[PDB]
Design a protein around this ligand. Structure first.
Ligand SMILES: *[C@@H]1O[C@H](CO)[C@@H](O[C@@H]2O[C@H](CO)[C@@H](O[C@@H]3O[C@H](CO)[C@@H](O)[C@H](O[C@H]4O[C@H](CO)[C@@H](O)[C@H](O)[C@@H]4O)[C@@H]3O)[C@H](O)[C@H]2NC(C)=O)[C@H](O)[C@H]1NC(C)=O
Ligand code: CUO
Ligand code: CUO
Lengths: 210, 105
């Protein structure tokens, strides 16, 4: 439901976040350079929480964080949710094409949402979209069964497996992509994904109110 | 076993330190008029009559493929640096080829 203005402003704000240091600094919270030794600690682990019921919470905050700094970079709107529950013949416009036309500069420029840079390994996030991603309506039924959940933890497990799905379909075969937990955050679509996931959680909460 | 950059996606213009880009005009998609255009190109008995319609027809795609960017297919200057160029022109050549054989018939 975006407009050309909102999209170009989102692209620009995020760009400002991108050529400067920041977004990588945020993606490193989830990503492969590990920061979390515990409990003694004997070894170090990645910081993001994934087996636990507090998986949503964590990632919830993640999106919050990035959106905050997005807005502070002059974004007209907060981070949108990309609803993949509805089947699609193509990828969303914002993230799909490698280059967008800049109206203000009157020139074609690289879409910041196409790929994120991983400079500490001197690589870039790539995407190999599995054909299973395009057009399947199974996600509808799956989210439906996620919402059925009275208990919070049942909710959480189905919620998070369902969330794993998109990661897998989108960044399938490359090592530096959405599919591998280590490098998943560096691909901007991450928060575009995890806001949407968050939305689902939000809905459930409201359902629970009912 | 890894995903790599497509060589055909963009050519690089290193003497001006840029890369070819593409702003695809919406008319390029689902254009069925090109059919009839080509048909009128074939109709020509004389060579120059063939050449002019053939080449305007050829200009069409150049224009609509890399429209708005300066370093692109649309500008005659940098059009060659986009790989699609020969992919384009071979097809252009094919048309001429057909015409040649037509002329034989
Ligand atoms: C809160 O965050 C801070 C910083 O984000 C974090 O401190 C950092 O911890 C990491 C470890 O998780 C440190 O990173 C290491 O730094 C050393 C050099 O100082 C490197 O040698 C390490 O390389 C690894 O691999 C080597 C083999 O190739 C091993 O020999 C080595 O043991 C390492 O496994 C690794 O990059 C980082 O230096 C600190 N930085 C700071 C500012 O202290 C802190 O741990 C976090 N606190 C909590 C409680 O989580
Ligand atoms: O959140 Cu940890 O990545 Cu989907
Ligand atoms: O011919 Cu189309 O390129 Cu000079």
């Amino acid at each position: 439901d975006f407009e050309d203005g909102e999209m170009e402003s989102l692209r620009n704000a995020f760009k400002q976040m991108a050529d400067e240091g920041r977004y990588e600094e945020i993606a490193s919270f989830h990503g492969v350079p590990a920061q979390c030794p515990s409990e003694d600690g004997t070894m170090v682990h990645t910081c993001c929480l994934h087996g636990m019921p507090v998986f949503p919470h964590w990632h919830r905050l993640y999106v919050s964080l990035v959106e905050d700094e997005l807005l502070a970079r002059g974004s007209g709107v907060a981070v949108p949710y990309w609803d993949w529950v509805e089947p699609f013949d193509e990828l969303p416009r914002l993230i799909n094409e490698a280059t967008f036309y800049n109206s203000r500069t009157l020139q074609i420029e690289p879409n910041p949402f196409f790929k994120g840079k991983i400079s500490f390994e001197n690589a870039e996030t790539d995407r190999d979209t599995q054909p299973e991603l395009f057009g399947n309506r199974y996600l509808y039924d799956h989210t439906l069964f996620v919402f059925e959940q009275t208990d919070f933890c049942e909710f959480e497990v189905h919620y998070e497996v369902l969330h794993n799905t998109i990661h897998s379909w989108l960044g399938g075969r490359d090592v530096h992509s959405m599919s591998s937990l280590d490098y998943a955050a560096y691909d901007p679509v991450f928060f575009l994904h995890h806001s949407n996931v968050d939305r689902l959680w939000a809905i459930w909460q409201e359902l629970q109110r009912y």
